[PDB]
Amino acid sequence: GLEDIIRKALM
Amino acid sequence: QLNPESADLRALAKHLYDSYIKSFPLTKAKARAILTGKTTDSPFVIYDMNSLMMGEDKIKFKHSKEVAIRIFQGCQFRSVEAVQEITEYAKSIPGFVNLDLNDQVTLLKYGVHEIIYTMLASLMNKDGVLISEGQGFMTREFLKSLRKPFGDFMEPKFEFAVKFNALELDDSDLAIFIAVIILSGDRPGLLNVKPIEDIQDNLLQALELQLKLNHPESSQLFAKLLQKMTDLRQIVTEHVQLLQVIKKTETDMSLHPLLQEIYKDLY
Numbered sequence A: 001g002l003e004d005i006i007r008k009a010l011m
Numbered sequence B: 001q002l003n004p005e006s007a008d009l010r011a012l013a014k015h016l017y018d019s020y021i022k023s024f025p026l027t028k029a030k031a032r033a034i035l036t037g038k039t040t041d042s043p044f045v046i047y048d049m050n051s052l053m054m055g056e057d058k059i060k061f062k063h064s065k066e067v068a069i070r071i072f073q074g075c076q077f078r079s080v081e082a083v084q085e086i087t088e089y090a091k092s093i094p095g096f097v098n099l100d101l102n103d104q105v106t107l108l109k110y111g112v113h114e115i116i117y118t119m120l121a122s123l124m125n126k127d128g129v130l131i132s133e134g135q136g137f138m139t140r141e142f143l144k145s146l147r148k149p150f151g152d153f154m155e156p157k158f159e160f161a162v163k164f165n166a167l168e169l170d171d172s173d174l175a176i177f178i179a180v181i182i183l184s185g186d187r188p189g190l191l192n193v194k195p196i197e198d199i200q201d202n203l204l205q206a207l208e209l210q211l212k213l214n215h216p217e218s219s220q221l222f223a224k225l226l227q228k229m230t231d232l233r234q235i236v237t238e239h240v241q242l243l244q245v246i247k248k249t250e251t252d253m254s255l256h257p258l259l260q261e262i263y264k265d266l267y
Ligand SMILES: *c1ccc([N+](=O)[O-])cc1C(=O)Nc1ccc(C(N)=O)cc1
Pocket: B071, B072, B073, B074, B075, B076, B113, B153, B154, B236, B237, B239, B263, B264, B265, B266, B267
């Protein structure tokens, strides 16, 4: 969940 | 001493501060103004069960069967905004977005928790912590008094925050410190450590200069601040131990709903 949230925020 | 390099480091420091101010609405300056009684716009103090219930109107409900796990699920969900702010901040760090994207994610997935605790310290004094978006103040001893395992949730963060806040960092310092946290070349699973260390070396130079210019009174502040990363990591990894304490706990783990909501705003 966190890695996905960060990956998304980095988009 | 004031040469092209030092000017570049000051420009980096300013760039990070500006991005920090843009990314983080809750600054230390704002928190300390509240804690030292300067914002006349003032937090209700929750210091015992009686004042907790009297504060019911000010704790707004936002939302597992285990209360502690529900608290952690709630606070981690509520932390997404912080994680996104920190990630946004990280994009402003020169070179960060050019790193292998796996390494960017790895750096952030470890760094965000340490940054959250760093910024949580801004909300803390030795007496307690601002909650409910600066609208409430939860005392440290009230939190410590709660039945196990809840009474142990926050005290190590308070112990850290007292030691960290004794450094008297301001937001200009914190802006660089947080960047140094993110660019930690020691995170497990990092693919290309050297470009990360290249950035961190630059940030460390910037932090060293920032602390020299900003804290004439503090010997070895740079070293002392870097040593606080040890405490930050300890606090994060202590959460693993807390989870094991919770699974093993067979005593009553009920918690007043208002305390659960308050903890969900904590970390
Ligand atoms: C949320 C709300 C309160 C507390 N607490 O009082 O200890 C803790 C949390 C929480 O879940 N903190 C947390 C989440 C995730 C990590 C991590 N992935 O390392 C650490 C700590």
